[PDB]
Design a protein around this ligand. Structure first.
Ligand SMILES: CCn1c(-c2cc(N3CCN(C)CC3)cnc2[C@H](C)OC)c2c3cc(ccc31)-c1csc(n1)C[C@H](NC(=O)[C@H]1C[C@@H]1C)C(=O)N1CCC[C@H](N1)C(=O)OCC(C)(C)C2
Ligand SMILES: Nc1nc2c(ncn2[C@@H]2O[C@H](COP(=O)(O)OP(=O)(O)NP(=O)(O)O)[C@@H](O)[C@H]2O)c(=O)[nH]1
Ligand SMILES: [Mg+2]
Lengths: 169, 162
């Protein structure tokens, strides 16, 4: 049977979590602001020559509900931690999302990928080397993405599947 | 304080009429926006639009008449207008309050509470309350879900001022 992988997308409001997810699932780019409550998606993909099923939870970045993340952090197998490269605050929120995931999972070793989104925009405020250094100190991969141009979208989700797979085995 | 009405339909079948008092004494600008959008007198408004987000236990949200997907809407003052005041609180079922995308982003989207939602106080402008037909709003919860997606099309078939 096909292996199912439970992925969760987290990050501050407006960084592009849903835009990335809808690019992966539906291959189109949502220009509009549609803040998420909670959404779930399914997609089968071929990764390293094997078909697998991605179950993707798109979560709310709305800062008011930070105390209600525990249930989905318990069930998720791997985490896409998204910031936007033109929003320094979203980059600083990353540390807090990661710690929260570690606290709920009670584990310092959780499949994760750091994602710097909106790399199509010129107004960059977070330096690539700064995110590379941060990811290196976490021991996790780092990928720059654009949900607008699709740059890195497949690679980010596929890399997280590879991380989860290494953790299961 | 003016009174407006919505005639609600479920997949085109009548469900009944909900009426609202609009608190023009406390939030005159916000009340006038909703009143004018209910009559359609500016050439656009709520008639024909849907309730796109219904979460049982919390609220029914609608008013996106420009995009019909939860991302649109506009006020009679422009696409957005400022938070008028937060004098009134989300005290219980029937409160009518503005949806928004953060500070000073009111448009046309609104929500009707079906419970007390105290943590929204100071963040959403309360401007009205259900006068008659609260059980119709309760009945709209039958078509909602945990993330708000509706199982039938809940529309404002007609609306106006009483
Ligand atoms: C943690 C999960 N969650 C939850 C939540 C919260 C609880 N609590 C239990 C304990 N009590 C004490 C505290 C709360 C329980 N269960 C859930 C849900 C059912 O678990 C899935 C909410 C929520 C809201 C947003 C994101 C995630 C969210 C959000 C995301 S954008 C937003 N809010 C504000 C929203 N802007 C818009 O639409 C903009 C586009 C237009 C212009 C908006 O103006 N309005 C009007 C007011 C209501 C709000 N929509 C809305 O829909 O609130 C849903 C509600 C369920 C009331 C709160
Ligand atoms: N230029 C550009 N804009 C993007 C990109 N990703 C998302 N956006 C835009 O940024 C805004 C927010 O996108 P969205 O995916 O809704 O963000 P979110 O993280 O899901 N927000 P929430 O946590 O409220 O659900 C939208 O206007 C969207 O079109 C990107 O890669 N490039
Ligand atoms: Mg989202």
């Amino acid at each position: 049977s096909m292996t199912e992988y439970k992925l969760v997308v987290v990050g501050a409001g407006g960084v592009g979590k849903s835009a990335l997810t809808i690019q992966l699932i539906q291959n189109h780019f949502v220009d509009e602001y549609d803040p998420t409550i909670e959404d779930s998606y399914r997609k089968q993909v071929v990764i390293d020559g094997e078909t697998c099923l991605l179950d993707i939870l798109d979560t709310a970045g709305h800062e008011e509900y930070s105390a209600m993340r525990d249930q989905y952090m318990r069930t998720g197998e791997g985490f896409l931690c998204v910031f936007a490269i033109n929003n320094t605050k979203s980059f600083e929120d990353i540390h807090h999302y990661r710690e929260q995931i570690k606290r709920v999972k009670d584990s310092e070793d959780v499949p994760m990928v750091l994602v710097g989104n909106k790399c199509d925009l010129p107004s960059r405020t977070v330096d690539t080397k700064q995110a590379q250094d941060l990811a290196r100190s976490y021991g996790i991969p780092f990928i720059e993405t654009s949900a607008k141009t699709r740059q890195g979208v497949d690679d980010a989700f596929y890399t997280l599947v590879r991380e989860i797979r290494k953790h299961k085995e | 304080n003016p009174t407006v009405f919505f005639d609600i339909a479920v997949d085109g079948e009548p469900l009944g009429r909900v009426s609202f008092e609009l608190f023009a004494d406390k939030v005159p600008k916000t009340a006038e926006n909703f009143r004018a959008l209910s009559t359609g007198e500016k050439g656009f408004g709520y008639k024909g639009s849907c309730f796109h987000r219904i979460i049982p236990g919390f609220m029914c949200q609608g008013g996106d008449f420009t995009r019909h997907n939860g991302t649109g809407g506009k006020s009679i003052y422009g696409e957005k207008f400022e938070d008028e005041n937060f004098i009134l609180k989300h005290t219980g079922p029937g409160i009518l309050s503005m949806a928004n995308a953060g500070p000073n982003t009111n448009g046309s989207q609104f929500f009707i509470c079906t419970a007390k939602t105290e943590w929204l106080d100071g963040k959403h402008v309360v401007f009205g309350k259900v006068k008659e037909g609260m059980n119709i709003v309760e009945a709209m919860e039958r078509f909602g879900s945990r993330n708000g997606k509706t199982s039938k099309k809940i529309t404002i078939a007609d609306c106006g001022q009483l």
